[PDB]
Amino acid sequence: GPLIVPYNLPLPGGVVPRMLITILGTVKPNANRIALDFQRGNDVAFHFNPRFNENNRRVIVCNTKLDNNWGREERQSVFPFESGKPFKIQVLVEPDHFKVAVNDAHLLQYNHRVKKLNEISKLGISGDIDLTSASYTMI
Ligand SMILES: CO[C@@H]1O[C@H](CO)[C@H](O)[C@H](OCc2cn([C@@H]3O[C@H](CO)[C@H](O)[C@H](O)[C@H]3O)nn2)[C@H]1O
Ligand SMILES: [Cl-]
Ligand SMILES: [Cl-]
């Protein structure tokens, strides 16, 4: 049975290198967006935002939100998600960046702008997905 979206996954004591977060789900048909939000309190340390129809293009927007202001976006035109299809997102925390693979293929990395990794204590998962699983493990 699917989890309820938007879904909140506590990250006890924040994130740390060698921490692997795995999100399993299926994209809804005619999906418009997906969002992962690694949060430090109200701040979003790492925002991972696949957009299925931005001016008829598919793009993943990544960014950080500090004191309610979004920063400079990082955009990646490789777009492995497809409406209707099951996906696996793996977010591996490394010393200098978040490393994201989708369906076992490296997708992008996002350098740490928020430095207090052990305060990034919650992951919000939202958008047009049926969420199957969300978990973490130390590798
Ligand atoms: C290609 O240009 C863009 O096209 C967009 C529509 O597809 C919008 O018009 C953008 O400007 C408005 C905007 C800003 N944002 C926020 O960006 C955050 C990450 O930086 C987060 O994703 C945040 O949720 C989200 O609302 N969303 N829309 C515009 O810059
Ligand atoms: Cl699609
Ligand atoms: Cl910080």
UniProtKB/Swiss-Prot annotation:
UniProt keyword list: Acetylation, Cytoplasm, Differentiation, Disulfide bond, IgE-binding protein, Immunity, Innate immunity, Lectin, mRNA processing, mRNA splicing, Nucleus, Phosphoprotein, Repeat, Secreted, Spliceosome
GO CC aspect terms: cell surface; collagen-containing extracellular matrix; cytoplasm; cytosol; extracellular exosome; extracellular region; extracellular space; ficolin-1-rich granule membrane
Tissue occurrence: A major expression is found in the colonic epithelium. It is also abundant in the activated macrophages. Expressed in fetal membranes.
Keyword Phosphoprotein: yes
Domain Galectin: 7-137
Modified residues (Phosphoserine): S77
Sequence positions that bind a beta-D-galactoside: W70, G71, R72, E73, E74, R75, Q76
GO terms (BP aspect): eosinophil chemotaxis; epithelial cell differentiation; innate immune response; macrophage chemotaxis; monocyte chemotaxis; mononuclear cell migration; mRNA processing; negative regulation of endocytosis
Top-rank taxon, per record: Eukaryota
Subcellular localization, as worded in the UniProt entry: Cytoplasm; Nucleus; Secreted
GO molecular function, one term: laminin binding
Motif position, Nuclear export signal: 115-130
Its job: Galactose-specific lectin which binds IgE. May mediate with the alpha-3, beta-1 integrin the stimulation by CSPG4 of endothelial cells migration. Together with DMBT1, required for terminal differentiation of columnar epithelial cells during early embryogenesis. In the nucleus: acts as a pre-mRNA splicing factor. Involved in acute inflammatory responses including neutrophil activation and adhesion, chemoattraction of monocytes macrophages, opsonization of apoptotic neutrophils, and activation of mast cells.
Assembly notes: Probably forms homo- or heterodimers. Interacts with DMBT1. Interacts with CD6 and ALCAM. Forms a complex with the ITGA3, ITGB1 and CSPG4. Interacts with LGALS3BP, LYPD3, ZFTRAF1 and UACA. Interacts with TRIM16; this interaction mediates autophagy of damage endomembranes. Interacts with cargo receptor TMED10; the interaction mediates the translocation from the cytoplasm into the ERGIC (endoplasmic reticulum-Golgi intermediate compartment) and thereby secretion.
Name of this protein: Galectin-3
Originating organism: Homo sapiens (Human)
Gene: LGALS3
Positions spanned in the full protein: 112 to 250 of 250
